[PDB]
Structure 1
Amino acid sequence: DCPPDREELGRHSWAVLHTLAAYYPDLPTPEQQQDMAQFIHLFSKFYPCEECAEDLRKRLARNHPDTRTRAAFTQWLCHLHNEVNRKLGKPDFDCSKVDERWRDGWKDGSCD
């Protein structure tokens, strides 16, 4: 029960972000589309890893969140995460698997 470090906070943050994405509507209202884009922007203002937050705001200044549908947003966010992975020398996550990882469980049923 110590304050989470960069690694622990980062993992939990992605878990939160990818989970919210995984359950976002397939057919969001215009308000939901605006709200979710604003949510990601606000996260970028307050994420307390200052280097991380700066990096993120830079990225979002060009690459605005795609919140048009669940499919779009889950893909958008998976790609954003892979950009961070690449910076940190981590492998790309296969974005075609984003639903298995964050909603449905692996196809082999190992999460059932």
Structure 2
Amino acid sequence: EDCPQDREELGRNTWAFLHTLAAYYPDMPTPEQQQDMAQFIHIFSKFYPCEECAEDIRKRIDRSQPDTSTRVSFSQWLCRLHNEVNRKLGKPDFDCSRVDERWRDGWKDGSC
């Protein structure tokens, strides 16, 4: 908009960035790309703006390190992580089998 992001706005926008990032990550990433994405996620968890949120995500990420082996493993890992936060906030579980429809290709019914 025009004013500082609130917790929810920052969240929606960051998840959008993260899921899209994962959606276009290589299906066949090189060993270096796999190392970089894992490190990116690690650093991300240390600087995500919302203080309370970062403390929370770090604990979740340390418990289940990102699997950056492939586009699918990574996008699924990220979907599972987001779902953990969804459950913490009483939000619905997202069907991870549809992450590509949501963030890359659009719903199969063509509503996008």
TM bin (shorter chain)? over 0.9
Task: Determine if the alignment matches structure 1 residue 53 to structure 2 residue 62.
Answer: no
Task: Tell me how many residue pairs correspond in the alignment.
Answer: 111
Q: Kindly indicate whether residue 49 of structure 2 is the aligned counterpart of residue 38 of structure 1.
A: no
Tell whether 2:95 aligns with 1:110.
no
Give the deviation of 1:48 after TM superposition.
1.2
Quick one: distance in 2 between partners of 1:66 and 1:5?
A: 30
What per-residue deviation string (whole Å, max 9, x for no partner) do you get for residues 52-101 of structure 1? 00001111112101100001001000000000000000000000110000
Question: Structure 1: which 5+ runs fail to align?
Answer: none
Aligned-partner residue type, residue 102 of structure 2:
R
Name the CA distance, whole Å, in 2 between partners of 1:108 and 1:5.
33
What's 1:65 paired with? 66
What 5-or-longer segments of structure 2 have no aligned partner?
none
Q: Which amino acid aligns with 1:26?
A: D
* Aligned residue in 1 for 2:93: 92
Deviations 1:8-62 (CA, angstroms, capped at 9, x unpaired):
0000000000000000000000000000011111111111111100001111112
User: What is the rounded CA distance, in whole Å, between the counterparts of 1:33 and 1:57 in structure 2?
Assistant: 19
TM-score normalised by length of structure 2: 0.97
Q: Which runs of 4+ in 1 moved over 4 A?
A: none
Q: Identity over the aligned pairs, expressed in percent?
A: 85
Check if 1:7 corresponds to 2:8: yes
Structure 2 partner of 1:25: 26
Amino acid at match of 1:28: P
TM-score, with length taken from structure 1? 0.97
